[PDB]
Design a binder for this molecule. Structure first.
Ligand code: GDP
Ligand code: MG
Length: 184
């Protein structure tokens, strides 16, 4: 008896360093497409339909960015948030360092009791030869899975998830988990 069942409305906010792939993640989830050209700073206003554990959910997707007006509209994004996606890039150890240094303090300040899913995006670059060579000149290497999991443990995240928006792998499961968290 699913027909006519009222949908549940929930709000998701996605944050993280510039160029880690926040907007690309939202477009892959919403449209089942990895865009490569003409991608905006933030994804269009979007409410996604998702069915999880038998519940019909309408999930509002709030994208954020990091300069000028976006520095100001970002803190205004947090009211009434039900789940946070906090993103770093596996090809950027620096973006992972900003998880405890910047993003977790900001989210705890404005969204104290809201579940956080820590997302390591660009997992397709972990074993990319060119990426590994560029990071090697800085004596760095791509983030290891256990390093992402460790950071998720440290910040009390609802979960740790890895994605490639480029291949689309893992993206559905991130938003399914976020929806389960939002329903809590
Ligand atoms: N290789 C790879 N590139 C990605 C991935 N996700 C995003 N990108 C690229 O990373 C850049 C930043 O993507 P964007 O979605 O604009 O990042 P945002 O600033 O966090 O919204 C673009 O060149 C994307 O094509 C991914 O999973 N793998
Ligand atoms: Mg963006």
């Amino acid at each position: 008896y699913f027909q006519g069942m009222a949908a549940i409305r929930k709000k998701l906010v996605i944050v993280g360093d510039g160029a880690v792939g926040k907007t690309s993640l939202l477009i892959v989830f919403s449209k089942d497409q990895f865009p490569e050209v003409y991608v905006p700073t933030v994804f269009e206003n979007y409410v996604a339909d998702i069915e999880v554990d038998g519940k019909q959910v309408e999930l509002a997707l709030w994208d954020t960015a990091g300069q000028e007006d976006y520095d100001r509209l970002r803190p205004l994004s947090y009211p009434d948030t039900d789940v946070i996606l906090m993103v770093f890039s596996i090809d950027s150890p620096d973006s992972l360092e900003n998880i405890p240094e910047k993003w977790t303090p900001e989210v705890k300040h404005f969204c104290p009791n809201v579940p956080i899913i820590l997302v390591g995006n660009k997992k397709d670059l972990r074993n990319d030869e060119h990426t590994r060579r560029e990071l090697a000149k800085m004596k760095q290497e791509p983030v290891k899975p256990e390093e992402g999991r460790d950071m998720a443990n440290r910040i009390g995240a609802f979960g740790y998830m890895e994605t490639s928006a480029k291949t689309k792998d893992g993206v559905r499961e991130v938003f399914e988990m976020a929806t389960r968290a939002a329903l809590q």
